[PDB]
From a paper:
Finally, we successfully obtained high quality crystals of the α3_SAM123/LAR_D1D2 complex and determined the crystal structure with a 2.85 Å resolution. Except for the insertion loop connecting the SAM1 and SAM2 domains and a few short loops in the SAM3 domain, three α3_SAM123 molecules were modeled, each interacting with one LAR_D1D2 molecule to form a 1:1 complex with the buried area of ~1100 Å2 on both sides. In the complex, LAR interacts with liprin-α3 via the D2 domain via two conserved binding sites, site-I and II. The very N-terminal residues in the αN-helix and its N-terminal loop of the SAM1 domain interact with the pocket mainly formed by the C-terminal residues of the D2 domain through hydrophobic interactions, hydrogen bonds, as well as charge–charge interactions, supported by the weakened interaction between α2_SAM123ΔN and LAR_D1D2. The three D1/D1 interfaces, each covering approximately 1000 Å2 surface area, are highly similar with predominantly hydrophilic interactions mediated mainly by the conserved residues in the loop regions of the D1 domain, indicating that the D1/D1 packing in the crystal is unlikely to be a nonspecific interaction.
The leukocyte common antigen-related receptor protein tyrosine phosphatases (LAR-RPTPs), also named as Type IIα RPTPs, are cell surface receptors important for the developing nervous system.
Numbering used by the authors:
A (entry chain E): 806 to 905, 951 to 1116
B (entry chain A): 1328 to 1650, 1654 to 1905
Write the structure that this text describes.
Amino acid sequence: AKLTGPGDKDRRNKRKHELLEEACRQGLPFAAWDGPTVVSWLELWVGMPAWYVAACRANVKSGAIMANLSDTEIQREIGISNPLHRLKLRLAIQEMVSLTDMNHEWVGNDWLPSLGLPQYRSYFMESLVDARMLDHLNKKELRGQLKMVDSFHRVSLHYGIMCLKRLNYDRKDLERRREESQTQIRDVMVWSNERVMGWVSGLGLKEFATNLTESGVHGALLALDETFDYSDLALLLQIPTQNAQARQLLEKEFSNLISLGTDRRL
Amino acid sequence: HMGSIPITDLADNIERLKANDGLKFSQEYESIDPGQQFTWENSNLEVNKPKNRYANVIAYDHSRVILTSIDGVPGSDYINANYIDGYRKQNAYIATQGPLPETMGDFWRMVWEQRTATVVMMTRLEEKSRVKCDQYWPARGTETCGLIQVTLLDTVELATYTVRTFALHKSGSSEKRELRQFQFMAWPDHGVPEYPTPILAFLRRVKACNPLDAGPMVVHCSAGVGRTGCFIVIDAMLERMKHEKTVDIYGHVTCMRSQRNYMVQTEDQYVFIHEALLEAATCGHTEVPARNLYAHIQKLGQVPPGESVTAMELEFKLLASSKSRFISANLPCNKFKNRLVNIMPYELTRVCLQPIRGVEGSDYINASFLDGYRQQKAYIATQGPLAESTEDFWRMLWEHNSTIIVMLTKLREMGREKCHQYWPAERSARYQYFVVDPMAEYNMPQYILREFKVTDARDGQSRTIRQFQFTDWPEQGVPKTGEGFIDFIGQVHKTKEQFGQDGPITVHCSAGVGRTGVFITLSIVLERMRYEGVVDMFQTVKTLRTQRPAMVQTEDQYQLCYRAALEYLGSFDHY
């Protein structure tokens, strides 16, 4: 960016932290905040689109009203008919009350592809799914709205989330752990789809590794699921059944992988 | 002309060459002759033959680029490449073939030893399932090609070209060199480009970024003689124009043939060079840095000496001055599918629907693909749907994964229909194969947002399609300020990003050219101004008009674009 202004990313990010600082400095609990205060909160910290914040500017006069807003009241005063958008909101206001980064862009552009699930990017982002919402996803919400009809992908998703909880949602810690496991066969729970593909081609199976793209195969699944053996992985690599040598290298090396880099009972 | 031409006589000369099925062009092109014999002993050596992509495209010995010899390895000095003189610049370019898998190390070592700062790639890696060149740069990180260690630092993808920045390291040395690569993306799979506007943009970008104190610029394509030749001669002749206001294409190609075989290897390419330079001679220079925009607009509103209207008007007239392209649009079976019978899509860039068996013209809709700042086919510009074309309209959005619509009119204005209500208001509706459900509707000061749930009745898959309707466009003339419209353009694109909608943005007004032009023009210009700090209005509209006729239809609409750009600028720090 050659020209800079208040519309930049870091400018809006600093103003966000400055309004928050101003809130927690003045001492006001969430329920005491003004009208203008909660609508600048919706834009900047929650990240709602302008049409939501317009309906909030016209219908919510205080944080007290907002906090007590029922599910059906949200739909008619803020205008949010989207259930996952509501969820984003209820968790947001809930977090603020109890307290008085990893947003949907991160989930969509970073996390999801590392799970080997990039296809679902559009739907997750359209629904504004941040990290905070992941454990609160219904089976109905996954199947329908987020289009995950493949049950394995929901499982793949499930173990991805479990991994995040194992790491207390620390993105910095996650990224570091991934870096330190690039060259060794240790702690595969943190392994991405790349790293797994990178592992597979290292065994001498370069011709199948690319077939793990959009497969939902990632390290957290291998490490946390006991029902997942080499045969599951074999057909996800689209390995010919008659190919006995491959299904040998894979089986042996899959055993080395789990034994050396997980805590699984096999 | 077999010699120098003043640029004022260029158009007339091109006309004479074109006459009688271009008899004169052929005779001239066929007569090009260096008038000497050459040798290519090094290219024919048994060890170097595999280093030639085409056996019949070789490097003349006197002008070939010689690499340093590697002890113990015969043929270490060879790469299929030759120096090419530029305008008043000796060995200004290096024409080479696109590297083979086994000459990639040689290729990079040439770049090092020649102290090259800029590589120009005139091809995509693959065109029509045919390999034109092998990828020789790392997609990510650092790779080692022979003795050179290549590191990808930065990539910038724009619609017609990509820029990559590399850092080079040679083994045994602590020296670090920077190298930028410019890849051209808008050369068709067959023949020459229909328009010279994109290639001219590319050259201007390259001239701007190639340091004045570097080694020769490497230019390559497939064999390094065709597209490579065209780039080089246009670049040289642009410089000659800048200095002498003449051109000697025939002269320069002749000299180039003394350095490498077949430079400019087809006649249509020879013609393309002429046409490109005619466009450059005609359009002048219209880019202005943000710093100078205010004064520039003041200046455009003035009437030059000996003229009758403002520079703005003249500039606008010039957009039209650079003119059977409506084939499907004129088919009897499709005429009623055009809201205005005189506003039709170009055949090359029109949006096509999957044909339906037995129904002639079921593949047609009055809509064109338009390029964005960063990607091609970023916008679909179409007319305000007719009731006749509503079913087709929904089918277009589905077949082309467009999930954001932009409406720039009311349903009726001035007592006439601008657009049919193609969407359900209160209850569901079935439009042939598709079921459209009204999900929500949000009223904002200067626009309305409508969300739909579209379902394919064939398999049951569904998408959310969103429509942004602008309500504050005056039914006579243009907005006094662009404040509201700029914000609208921001919201539409902010939505595309925040919701991860990868498909095109469908834009419509009445005929799909006036207000739609303004929307798309400003979408590109405002982003380019934010990231490059420059404004090229004329070039932006002129590019658009090569993809759909008459984009930005009236001068007050053009005036509006300038006015809005200045307003957007005011919202930045320095300004």
